[PDB]
Amino acid sequence: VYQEPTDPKFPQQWYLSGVTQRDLNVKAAWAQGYTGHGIVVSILDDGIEKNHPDLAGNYDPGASFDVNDQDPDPQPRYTQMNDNRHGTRCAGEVAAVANNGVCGVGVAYNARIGGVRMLDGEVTDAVEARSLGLNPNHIHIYSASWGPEDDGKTVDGPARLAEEAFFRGVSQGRGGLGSIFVWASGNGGREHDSCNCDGYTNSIYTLSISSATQFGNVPWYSEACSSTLATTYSSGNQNEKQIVTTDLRQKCTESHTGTSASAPLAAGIIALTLEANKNLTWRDMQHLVVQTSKPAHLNANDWATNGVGRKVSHSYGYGLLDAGAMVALAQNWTTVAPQRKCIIDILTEPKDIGKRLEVRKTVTACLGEPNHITRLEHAQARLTLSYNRRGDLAIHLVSPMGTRSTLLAARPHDYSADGFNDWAFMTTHSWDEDPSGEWVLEIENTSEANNYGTLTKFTLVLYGTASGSLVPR
Amino acid sequence: XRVX
Ligand SMILES: [Ca+2]
Ligand SMILES: [Ca+2]
Ligand SMILES: [Ca+2]
Ligand SMILES: [Cl-]
Ligand code: NA
Ligand code: NA
Ligand code: NA
Numbered sequence: 001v002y003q004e005p006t007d008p009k010f011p012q013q014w015y016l017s018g019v020t021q022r023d024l025n026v027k028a029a030w031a032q033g034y035t036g037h038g039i040v041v042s043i044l045d046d047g048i049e050k051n052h053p054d055l056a057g058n059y060d061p062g063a064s065f066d067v068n069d070q071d072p073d074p075q076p077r078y079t080q081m082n083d084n085r086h087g088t089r090c091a092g093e094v095a096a097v098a099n100n101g102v103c104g105v106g107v108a109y110n111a112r113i114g115g116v117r118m119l120d121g122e123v124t125d126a127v128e129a130r131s132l133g134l135n136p137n138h139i140h141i142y143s144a145s146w147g148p149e150d151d152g153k154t155v156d157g158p159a160r161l162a163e164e165a166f167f168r169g170v171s172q173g174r175g176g177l178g179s180i181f182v183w184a185s186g187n188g189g190r191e192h193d194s195c196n197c198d199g200y201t202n203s204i205y206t207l208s209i210s211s212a213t214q215f216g217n218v219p220w221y222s223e224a225c226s227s228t229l230a231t232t233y234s235s236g237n238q239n240e241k242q243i244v245t246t247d248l249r250q251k252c253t254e255s256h257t258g259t260s261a262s263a264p265l266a267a268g269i270i271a272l273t274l275e276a277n278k279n280l281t282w283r284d285m286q287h288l289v290v291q292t293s294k295p296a297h298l299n300a301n302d303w304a305t306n307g308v309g310r311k312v313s314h315s316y317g318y319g320l321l322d323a324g325a326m327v328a329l330a331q332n333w334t335t336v337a338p339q340r341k342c343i344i345d346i347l348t349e350p351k352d353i354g355k356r357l358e359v360r361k362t363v364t365a366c367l368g369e370p371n372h373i374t375r376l377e378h379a380q381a382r383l384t385l386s387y388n389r390r391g392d393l394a395i396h397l398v399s400p401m402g403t404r405s406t407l408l409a410a411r412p413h414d415y416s417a418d419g420f421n422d423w424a425f426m427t428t429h430s431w432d433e434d435p436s437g438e439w440v441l442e443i444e445n446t447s448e449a450n451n452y453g454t455l456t457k458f459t460l461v462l463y464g465t466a467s468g469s470l471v472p473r
Numbered sequence: 474x475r476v477x
Contacts, residue, residue, distance in 0.1 A: 046477060086477040123475035146477050156474075260477065 002031040009104040009244050012254055014214065015233035015265070016107065022214065022297070024232060024265065026107055028324025029272045036108025038278075039271040041094050041141045043264070044131045045087030047076030048115025052088060054246045055113060057097040058106075062138050063114020067130050068121035076248060077120055085248035087115050089256045090145050092246030093264035094271065103252035104244040107268025107323070108275075114139070119146055129161035132181070136173035140274055141180045143267035145260035147200045150188030150223070152413035153391065155423065157199015166205040170282045178282030180270055181206040184263035186223040192412055195225035202227040202426045204378040204463060207286060209266040210316055211259055214240035216297045221258050224302075224314040226397075226405040226427035229286065230293045231316040232265040234258060269323045277330040283377065284336055290431050291470075292326050295319035307401025307433040309473030314406055317428060337465040342366035342373050346441070346458040353387065353453045359441040365462055367436070373464040376435045380426045380461040381407055385443070386419040387453030394446045399430040400437025410446040419453065424461070432469060435462050 004010070004017070004027060014020075017027035042063040050059045050073075064074045076084035095106035095113035106113070118131040132142060148156035158166065169179030183206040185195045195201045201208035202225070210228045213219050213236025220236075235242040235257035243256035243265075273288060274280060280288070295303065295311040298320060303313050312318055346361045366372045381397050391414025395407040405427035439460060445451045 119475060119477060128475075146475055149474055149476055 005098045005105045007098060007104050008101065009252060009254065013104045013244050014241050022216065024269065024320065025322045025324040026269065029327045032327055034272040034275045034327045036095065036111025036271045036275055039108060039111040039141065039274050040114070040139050041108065041111055041143060041267055041271055042114045042116055042134065042139045043087050043091045044116045044118055044142055044144045045090055045146065046084040046119040047087045047117040048074045048091050049076060049088045049248060049250065050074065052246050052250050054092055054096040054100070054102045057100065058095045058111060058113045060112035060114045062135060063112060064116065065134050066117040067127050068117050074115040074117040082248050084120055086145065086260065088248050089245045089253065090143060090260060090264040091115055093243060093261060094143065094268040096246055103246055107265055108271035111271045125159035125161045128158065129165040132162060132165035133168060136169055136179050137175065140174055141182060141267050141270055143182045143264050144200065145184040145263050147186060148198050150186050150191060150193050152188050152191030152193040152411050153416060155197045155420070157202065166203060170205050177279065180282055180285055182263050182267040182270060183208045184259040185210045185228050187221040187259045188223045189219065189221040193223045194409055194411060195223040196227050196407060196425050202424070204426060207266065207289060209262045211262040212298055212316065212320065213237065217299050218315045222315055224409065226314060226407055226429055228314065228317040229428050230266070230289050230318050231298065231320050232262040234261040266321055269321050269326060272323055273326040273330045276327040277333055279335065280330060280333065281335060283339060284333060287336060288326055288329055288333065289321065290318050292322050292329055293318035293320060294322050304403065306403040306429055307399065312429045337467050339463055340371040340373050340465060342371045342462040344460040346460055350454050350456045353385065353443050353455055356444040357455060359458060360438060362438045363436065363460065365435045372466050373462050374434050374466045375469050376430050376433050376462060376464040378426055378428060378463045379430055379435065380424040381441060382422050382424045382459040382461060383420050383455065384422050384457035385453055385455040388417055388451050389449065390414045390416040390419060392445050392447040392449065392451055394444050395425065396442040397427060398440040399433055400435060400439065401430065401433045403430045403433065405429045422457065
């Protein structure tokens with residue numbers, strides 16, 4: 001009979017288990033025998049207190065490096081303001097030691113945990129690339145609770161070295177199965193930010209994770225967008241509980257918050273899943289998340305049923321992760337077919353946007369060719385356009401099976417006149433749909449101002465396969 | 474940028 005942790009703060013880890021059913025169903029995975037044994041997770045952040053009493057037992061120097069100071073030791077820089085506590089807090093969510101009388105437990109409390117010290121300094125493209133590409137045949141899962149500024153006016157993503165690190169990771173990492181990159185979707189909710197304007201979250205190579213409050217609501221800091229894949233619990237208002245983890249200076253905190261806490265919990269759940277089937281590819285893992293995540297009792301006003309009967313929201317993706325369901329489904333999972341890419345250049349001429357622009361195109365999705373796709377994974381609308389005030393634009397993409405993805409909602413703070421330069425807006429909401437047929441792109445001016453611009457390029461990029469579909473939900 |  002599985003015995004649950006005895007750690008002093010484990011009873012406060014409401015998000016891991018409970019009779020209330022408002023949890024991530026992690027105890028069910030532990031009871032099936034999966035606690036993270038043999039899996040390696042690295043926290044890319046501001047350092048990791050490797051000697052912390054709740055991390056030392058799981059700490060892995062092979063999963064760690066200090067890119068800011070160019071040395072092996074990711075120990076945080078200590079200051080009066082405790083600025084560099086962030087990475088240690090994320091690490092304990094993944095892999096705090098269990099049954100040792102200290103603080104609480106990680107989701108994967110027997111996994112190995114490392115940290116890359118890379119935020120405590122100038123975060124160049126090279127710094128990011130050396131972190132994302134660290135020891136890719138030893139580290140299985142990378143967790144990143146950072147990204148571009150959440151001011152609600154920035155459009156930014158990986159530069160060349162970092163994007164090369166993503167491609168090298170998913171292609172050759174983990175023995176060719178592909179590095180697993182877990183990303184926090186952002187804290188720009190108050191600024192009405194969009195996580196599709198963040199190229200790290202919007203990347204197909206990352207599992208972008210949003211947050212839900214204890215009572216099942218969209219937290220104040222949450223960013224909505226179509227690239228988000230799933231959700232884990234984090235903080236909310238001051239009547240709602242928060243996240244329990246290891247803190248700087250060998251302390252325990254019950255008040256870790258925001259998007260930062262959701263990605264590490266997802267990374268832990270993914271670690272348990274990898275223990276259940278070490279042969280899962282980077283794409284397999286995204287399929288498992290899509291199929292097992294749970295919308296129930298997450299409140300949002302935009303829940304929609306997609307073409308294969310799955311509920312999806314821009315606040316939550318496919319819903320809350322379900323660790324027990326993940327590890328169960330992983331065990332007899334059949335590896336997905338190799339990824340196909342179908343490129344469709346939509347426009348025959350530039351189109352003035354004006355107050356509203358609708359572009360309709362019927363596609364065959366590379367019919368008759370080796371990259372024919374009947375089972376979509378990610379889809380991108382790669383858009384090049386000029387506009388006088390970028391944040392007044394709202395952009396939607398409708399799939400042939402009727403699923404309306406918001407690629408871009410209005411951003412009141414985005415005054416930019418720089419437009420979008422082949423920006424690859426991504427949606428997860430049409431996963432497993434047949435992409436053959438009519439796609440519709442809608443661009444509209446959400447303001448009363450007489451704005452102006454031109455759409456000069458729209459590439460529809462379809463990823464996926466031509467086999468293995470399930471009966472729709 | 475890059476923010477925690
Ligand atoms: Ca160091
Ligand atoms: Ca502990
Ligand atoms: Ca953001
Ligand atoms: Cl590609
Ligand atoms: Na590969
Ligand atoms: Na992503
Ligand atoms: Na169709």
